[PDB]
């Protein structure tokens, strides 16, 4: 599970483009604080190896 | 066990009503982000509840 892939981003990545920005996409007033739920989805996911 | 298989067809969806419920209510989704169904269409919807 060491290898992890960026599952979600606000916009599609450009060709030959690297993005390491881990800022969360908070869609509401509720702070995520690492909690998965309303308006809070983590952009990274561990590989299902 | 006798879950109601309520049909949803021929009507228009109002996902904006899905909010205003009790805070931090589970709002999980699979196969699509919850905010994209406004731009997506389907033949039928099952409102199992």
Curated annotation (Swiss-Prot), chain A:
Mutagenesis or variant effect for residue 8 to L: In strain: Omicron/EG.5.1
Segments of this protein annotated with the region Disordered: 7-42
Residue ranges of the region described as Receptor-binding motif: 1-49
Role played: Attaches the virion to the cell membrane by interacting with host receptor, initiating the infection. The major receptor is host ACE2. When S2/S2' has been cleaved, binding to the receptor triggers direct fusion at the cell membrane. When S2/S2' has not been cleaved, binding to the receptor results in internalization of the virus by endocytosis using host TFRC and GRM2 and leading to fusion of the virion membrane with the host endosomal membrane. Alternatively, may use NRP1/NRP2 and integrin as entry receptors.
Portion of the full-length sequence here: 449 to 497 of 1273
Effect of residue 35 to A: Increased resistance to neutralizing antibodies
Name of the gene encoding the protein in the UniProt record: S
Identification of the protein by name: Spike protein S1
Annotated disulfide bonds: 32-40
Effect of residue 27 to V: Increased resistance to neutralizing antibodies
Residue span of region Immunodominant HLA epitope recognized by the CD8+: 1-8
SUBUNIT field: Binds to host ACE2. RBD also interacts with the N-linked glycan on 'Asn-90' of ACE2. Cleavage of S generates a polybasic C-terminal sequence on S1 that binds to host Neuropilin-1 (NRP1) and Neuropilin-2 (NRP2) receptors. Interacts with host integrin alpha-5/beta-1 (ITGA5:ITGB1) and with ACE2 in complex with integrin alpha-5/beta-1 (ITGA5:ITGB1). May interact via cytoplasmic c-terminus with M protein. May interact (via N-terminus) with host bilirubin and biliverdin, thereby preventing antibody binding to the SARS-CoV-2 spike NTD via an allosteric mechanism.
Native species: Severe acute respiratory syndrome coronavirus 2
């Amino acid at each position: 599970y060491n290898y992890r892939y960026r599952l979600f981003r606000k916009s599609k990545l450009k060709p030959f483009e690297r993005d390491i920005s881990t800022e969360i996409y908070q869609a509401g007033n509720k702070p995520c604080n690492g909690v998965a739920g309303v308006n809070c989805y983590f952009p990274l996911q561990s590989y299902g190896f | 066990y006798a879950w109601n298989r309520k049909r949803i067809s021929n009507c228009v969806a109002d996902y904006s009503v899905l909010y205003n419920f009790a805070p931090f209510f589970a709002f999980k989704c699979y196969g699509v982000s919850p905010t994209k169904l406004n731009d997506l269409c389907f033949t039928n919807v099952y409102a199992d509840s």
